């Protein structure tokens, strides 16, 4: 009055509803009943004020803006600055606590948080204002940016109780040099994991129990002291079912991993180390896959493992199916072309344009194939039967020449227990054929046992007669077999070099065995002099098949 | 009265521009045009509301309040309560309905959302506010809350005709037990589905038609009564590319995913099925990938392949290129060690730390590398060029010592149609050498027909006289050939045991090809008594080799 | 002026703290000063205008709505329409250089926003509102929208300098049709793009110098004029360490990708290329990851590499380990079938169900696993030690049978420099057996110079008496070796016919060796005619063991 509008509240005044007065503040407030006696400035019954957003409201969707405020809240709403300056920790933890706040702690569009005390998350996930480069131009639109000077932080992590949320996020530690501050702790089952950037601390994602349905994605981890992301598992639970991918670790002192004790069915993939001083460490890794790694000098080591398990026989079943680039100093225990060891092998199936190989922990086998063929560990190669229980023999098949329409003839072979063949085709005449390599038997009456093939020995029946015979239990026989004798030693073991003539004849299995047929037991020799007179080598061999 | 600031609409006042008075609800409005003398309570033209966001500036920005409010639009600009208690579908359709909402429906802040009806969101994509554990607390934190008890949605699916987009979203179906009431159903083609938890529900994903380009991980789906994921695909119009990542599946009464028709080209990979009834089941799986896979316990099945194929022939062309972790019951039909079936093998390439396998579906053949070395599924190994048109011999070579500098020295082998040989080398004198499996060929009186090896046969030509000869069409030759004639069997097919002495003579194939060029069709061999009288045996064996 | 509110500013009147009065526009100021005679119209110093955001509170926060207005700020505080009409390019470039906001550029909740000019991103990443379908339904309710026709975007990219994220969206170029029109220029190092759909453009996503740590998933990329990804990298940094998954290139006139230059240690999965011109195409392609590509029909090209290297022995060291669909004219030089060539290989590792391979880019060795066995490129399948210093032999073991228990019976073979066998056993009696490949040697008179088999040749000491003996340097030795002697050419190469009686003697390496030991230098053959003389033949063969 008069001239300008401002009334203050009058104990001997009847407002009416809908009347309005300033506070001694100067809002104003505006009566909602009638007969209002009630002094605003110490009691607000009866009274709201007219600049508070549930008195205000947006007409296109009938609500107030009291409500419209709900549909995002920050660290913002309790007070933080994100100016690079101010300690936003009390906001920070005042949303965590607040009834308002849903299963997130979010920044604000634009700040620089400076954190200089702990957080407790309270089973809130953390989403950033955007996942930056590692340059200033990024930390000062957006990120938090833990005082690491600070000393209520010192060998503290400072985000504790994390939800299973991390995402869209840049955070930094500054001025935290050997203060061992650490940036956030997680638990290991159910957690999504993805676009951030983290830069310093001592180890930047701290996974508490043990892993499982743990996911980890495009991050960039930058200048750790200790660990990229470490797992103690404390209570050795072990690990399972841990996803880490399109991770750029660079310029840690330490390691980019660190598991304590065991990990097993995890996945590895697109990982990148550069300037690190140690890769992904553990105490086992059982049956994990690992894809593609871009492993690139060391910041002051001199070699280290990309991969490094240190517990006896306790990296096994594992994939090995990505390429391993390494450059500047790192080594790798799991190269397809690496030599095996009697125990101790990084165990597992690698597969890589350097090779195709697979090798267990505890054992010298390993098998590698190259553009050149195969290469043994144990200088042995198997040739067998899937099933376990099938006795068969085997057939190689190889191709040797074409047929008469011009397409690839594979001949055959045979290897029983009997009969060592490789067959052939003339496809001029149309007849199959076959080369041989029969069993050698030799004589010798210096021996002092027979020599045996296979159940047959050579025997001397009676001066000039020799018995090429089964021994007892050998029930295998001939059948139309070829055979050779060979060149008698006359006289003495060194021979005289006097020689003889041979005939043979068989030996039936039953009556008329051979003669109806062609089944033997054996053979004997027959050895005469140049007089038609039987005669008695010292030594002699014999050659035979069992079959045609 | 004076004291105070109320002035209602007075129909005999003008009311210049900027003017202010109460309407009857005591809002306060401003004229906005010069002489006004209409009733703001029964017409607004030439008035504005001073409480509306249109009225309220940022002077930040110079905008208003309105425009800022366009932001970001919830379902909570619609009414939604979010208060676990209060339907809130009539909003979630009313913000699907809006003319001002985007291509997503998004959540507020926080909230428990209650829906008891079936919400259409006419292609909209559904945004939440959060992936969290599956557990109250995040639940009560933000989710959508679907009342299974409804009757509006017994055997219905909750959200219909969603857009390409469900991301950072938890959802329950509360009290549904019994009530096959399924969460949301999208199309097929073009899908990115991130970062879900999903808790209850008969189906939790719906797919409608059938997949491609559809994009599904990061997922949390947790004691679903039928399936995690179902597509019926009742056009059988084939789904594609489809990817399926990240995904754990726990304690549901069905399946992980059922496809009731065909699958071709989709990818799965770092799934989990912790205590389910089934895996992933399909009429047809083709050319699909397959990576890590943890599979651990049965809800109250006793034993489930971890993929189920149901049509004959039908599980074909795939990778199956991640370990398969089997606990508790989980079987499988594409291990690399498992053996192969005549027919409907779970057809593709299998690559893991337990064997490196490869088979098709319709055929007994199963190739396996090992540690070891190799197994076959069908009692063969082929040998051959990549090449079908290639029809040169092999040389396989070997390692069977060292050079004289000690390094390896691998041997060459030949197989040809002629010829059969393991080359050697002594290093000492600087020999190359070999070993050799002749062709055998025995001559026998009593044979219907005779033996042929390779095109050559023996007949006999005059007493003591016999041709080891080339039939009609051998056009093959003998070149430097070596020759071992066999043991005669003299008098019968046993023999008497009288022996008899040989020599030869080779058959040239033109004049002088043996004299000059050691060419040769055959050789003949000669018999004779110790008389030196020609004789005939009644059988005996010949070696010989076609190249020295 | 009694009946309503509304007074201007008087110079002769002194405002009290609090005192409302009117700007001459209509808007209320109040005064927050004491004895205020400030004309608020000319001088706002000591009022506060009441309808700012400033002046507005959420009493649940206890703060201003001008803070909660920094939770969320998008183009649209800077005046952009999104109208499908409207120019926005200024209210773009405005958001990008201002001080308020934070690492990325934010659209609103619903626009369509036309862009006719270029805008500078300043380094801020590109956040859309929402990842839709290819459709006009999408793109009416959130995406860019840039105008192709504007005569200042002709040959040139709409956005420039991006940061590191390009996410949750929608992008089309209308009426550029021979424009020329780029959509964005995002560096090489440091970037997460995911969840885009890119409609029309000449290169849609342009990368500025060389990858590093990009990581590029799930995206929609249709109609490209040239294409999907293009980098140029002028300055050849090489790029390295790309992901490039869940990619729908579709109906593009050009390429998926296109690298001028070189890629190496890049990932790329879950791509599909339907009806595209041609897929990705670089000059170098080094260890790189390729997983599953689905490459169905051609634009209008009638033929189509999936992958196209263009440089000489340029691709290599790759992993080509998913399943590549080809239909309707795309075709592959990846495949493991696929023959080698001596050069230019696509080298690397091949997995899939078409099978196992393995080459390197500049020679013909190509190994190949399916099912029935192997196939060489080269005509050569080596077998040897992983060590390179390994010099012994292998043994090769093989299933002949069952043993007495009826367990699978794998039998030794032997191939060394002087030995080869192939061993078995008789389960019945209980004694190994063995086959045999002798050495053969063929003494010939009229051979220029001696036949020698592994140091060992054949000579005339006098009538009759040959030795099969050691030539200079050959230190090896015979040990209890199996002799057989062949067949003997009289009087002539062809021979006579005749025939002669043979015996040996053993040449011992010291006094002794033979008679006690059984180890020999070699041995003499001696032949005898009918009458028991000594005779020479013209030519003969010998067949011998260096072991039992």
């Not at 300033?22 to 209002?36: A, E, F, P, Y």
């Not at 590692?134 to 932080?153: A, H, K, M, Q």
């Amino acid at each position: 009055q008069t001239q300008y509008y401002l009334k203050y509240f009058n104990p001997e005044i009847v407002y009416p509803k809908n009347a309005r007065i300033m506070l001694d503040n100067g809002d104003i407030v505006r009566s909602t009943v009638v007969n209002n006696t009630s002094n605003p400035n110490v009691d607000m019954t009866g009274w709201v004020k007219v600049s508070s957003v549930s008195q205000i409201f947006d007409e296109t969707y009938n609500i107030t803006q009291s409500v419209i405020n709900g549909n995002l809240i920050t660290v913002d709403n309790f007070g933080a600055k994100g100016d690079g300056v101010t300690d936003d920790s009390a906001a920070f933890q005042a949303y965590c606590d607040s009834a308002l706040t849903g299963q997130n702690l979010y920044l604000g569009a634009k700040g620089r948080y400076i954190l200089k005390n702990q957080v407790d998350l309270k089973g809130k996930g953390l989403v950033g204002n955007g996942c930056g480069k590692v340059s200033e131009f990024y930390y000062n639109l957006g990120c938090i940016d833990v005082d690491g000077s600070s000393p209520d932080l010192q060998g503290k992590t400072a985000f504790i109780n994390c939800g299973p949320t991390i995402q869209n996020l840049t955070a930094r530690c500054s001025n935290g040099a050997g203060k061992q501050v650490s940036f956030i702790e997680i638990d290991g089952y159910l957690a999504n994991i993805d676009h951030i950037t983290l830069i310093n601390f001592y180890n930047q994602i701290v996974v508490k129990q043990a892993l499982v349905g743990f996911n980890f994605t495009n991050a960039w981890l930058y200048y750790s002291q200790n660990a990229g992301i470490y797992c103690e598992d404390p209570l050795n639970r072990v690990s399972t079912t841990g996803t880490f991918h399109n991770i750029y670790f660079q310029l840690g002192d330490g390691h980019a991993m660190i598991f304590d004790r065991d990990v097993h069915g995890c996945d590895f993939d697109n990982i990148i180390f550069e300037s690190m001083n140690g890769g992904i460490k553990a105490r086992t890794v059982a049956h994990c896959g690992f894809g593609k790694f871009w492993c690139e000098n060391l910041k002051t080591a001199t070699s280290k493992d990309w991969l490094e398990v240190t517990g006896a026989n306790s990296c096994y079943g594992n994939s090995f199916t990505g390429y391993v680039k390494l450059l500047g100093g790192w080594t790798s225990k799991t190269s397809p072309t690496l030599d095996s060891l009697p125990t101790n092998n990084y165990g597992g199936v690698s597969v890589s344009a350097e090779g195709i190989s697979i090798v267990n922990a505890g054992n010298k086998a390993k098998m590698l194939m190259l553009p050149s063929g195969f290469k043994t560990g144990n200088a042995t190669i198997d040739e067998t039967h899937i099933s376990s229980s099938t006795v068969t023999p085997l057939v190689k098949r190889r191709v040797i020449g074409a047929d008469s329409s011009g397409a690839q003839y594979l001949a055959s072979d045979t290897y029983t227990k009997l009969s060592r063949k490789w067959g052939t085709y003339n496809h001029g005449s149309n007849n199959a054929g076959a080369f041989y390599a029969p069993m050698m038997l030799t004589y010798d009456q210096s021996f002092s046992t027979p020599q045996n093939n296979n159940g047959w020995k050579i025997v001397k029946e009676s001066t000039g007669v020799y018995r090429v015979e089964r021994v007892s239990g050998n029930t295998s026989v001939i059948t139309n077999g070829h055979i050779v004798v060979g060149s008698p030693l006359m006289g003495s073991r060194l021979g005289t070099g006097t020689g003889a003539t041979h005939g043979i004849q068989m030996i039936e299995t039953y009556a008329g065995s051979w003669t109806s047929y062609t089944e033997a037991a054996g053979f004997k020799v027959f050895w005469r002099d140049s007089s038609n007179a039987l005669v008695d080598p010292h030594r002699f061999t014999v050659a035979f098949t069992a079959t045609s």
